[PDB]
């Protein structure tokens, strides 16, 4: 009643309404980044592979300079990195 109006009013959405009265669907993308690892990234841009040439490779998070060659190292089906007793990056599984 008076001073007791129902809080919600309905939208009158008729096809003959002017554009300012027509139902527009709105999606708001709210982007949140914080200490938690960034999990939703844009489609990752991967370049081509070239062997036997000193390049600045960026296999996933790992970056570095060097020439990369096909190898016989039998990685386990889950391993990505390669390393040695010197704790330096020796080999890498091609991500794609």
């Amino acid at each position: 009643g008076f001073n007791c109006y129902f809080p919600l009013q309905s939208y009158g959405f008729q096809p003959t309404n002017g554009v300012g009265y027509q139902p527009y669907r709105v999606v708001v993308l709210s982007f949140e980044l914080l200490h938690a690892p960034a999990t939703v990234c844009g489609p990752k841009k991967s370049t081509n592979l070239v062997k036997n040439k000193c390049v600045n490779f960026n296999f996933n998070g790992l970056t570095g300079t060097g020439v990369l060659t096909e190898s016989n190292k039998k990685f386990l089906p889950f391993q990505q990195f390669g390393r040695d007793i010197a704790d330096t990056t020796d080999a890498v599984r091609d991500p794609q």
């Epitope: 009643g1 008076f2 109006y5 129902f6 009013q9 309905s10 009158g12």
Partner: antibody
Framework: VQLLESGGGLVQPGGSLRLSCAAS????????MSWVRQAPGKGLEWVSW????????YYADSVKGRFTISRDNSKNTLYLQMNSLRAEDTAVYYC????????????????????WGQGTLVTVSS | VLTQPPSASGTPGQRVTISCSGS????????VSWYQQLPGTAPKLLIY???KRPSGVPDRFSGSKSGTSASLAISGLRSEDEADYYC???????????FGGGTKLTVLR
């Protein structure tokens, strides 16, 4: 913003007719509507008030029962059926927009009869 | 009922106080409004709150509701200021937007 009334004319005593108030220039569903009576050369006599059809309709003490107000938000119209009309009701009827929804910064005739139509004239006489 | 003077008046340039009074249900607990009906024309709301004034109205049309008495102060009267000034307020008890009697303001020429 404009409210145009139609249906004012000759009425036999005890007759029945329908004032139609076409409201344009504002979102009709958001503002309450009202009818206000003005006898020729006399003061404003409030007729009735409505906000929602399913809600409570308010009527003057002298018109309770013989008047019926209604809305049509699809047509943006306010309708007033007056039946069993009595002699003192010969007057001019104004269709007035009664804002009941005030927003934060927009300060607008909240609870004031904001905009009044041109008003029609009803003669209850044989 | 908003008991209002039947006909107030004043000379041009004066400040006329149109003071109407109803009850606690009429005006004490509800927002009063002041309308200016020129002869032959629909009324124009000059005051919508107890004090506030809508845009498009000269700043001289002041309003002030003290307790149960609402005062419409018109300062600097002119040939356009002569009209019927009604005060209207919603009734919490009777459930009706009761108007005032209607003050007939005229300028002292």
């Amino acid at each position: 913003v404009q409210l145009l009334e139609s249906g004012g004319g000759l009425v036999q005593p005890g007759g029945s007719l329908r004032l139609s108030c076409a409201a344009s220039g504002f979102t009709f569903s958001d503002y309450a509507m009202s009818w206000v009576r003005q006898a020729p050369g006399k003061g404003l006599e409030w007729v009735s008030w409505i906000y929602s059809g399913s809600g409570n309709k308010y009527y003057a003490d002298s018109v309770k029962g013989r008047f019926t107000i209604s809305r049509d938000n699809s047509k943006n119209t306010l309708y007033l059926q007056m039946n069993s009309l009595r002699a003192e009701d010969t007057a001019v009827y104004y269709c007035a927009r009664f804002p009941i929804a005030r927003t934060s910064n927009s300060q607008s005739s909240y609870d004031g009869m904001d905009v009044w139509g041109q008003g029609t004239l009803v003669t209850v006489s044989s | 009922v908003l008991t209002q003077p039947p006909s107030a008046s004043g000379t041009p340039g004066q400040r006329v106080t149109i003071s109407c009074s109803g009850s606690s249900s009429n005006i004490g607990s509800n927002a009063v409004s002041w309308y200016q009906q020129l002869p032959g024309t629909a009324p124009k709301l000059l005051i919508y709150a107890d004090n506030k004034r809508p845009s498009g109205v000269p700043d001289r049309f002041s309003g002030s509701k003290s307790g149960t008495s609402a005062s419409l102060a018109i300062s600097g009267l002119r040939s356009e200021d002569e009209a019927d000034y009604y005060c209207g307020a919603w009734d919490s008890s009777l459930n009706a937007y009761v108007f005032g009697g209607g003050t007939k303001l005229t300028v002292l020429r």
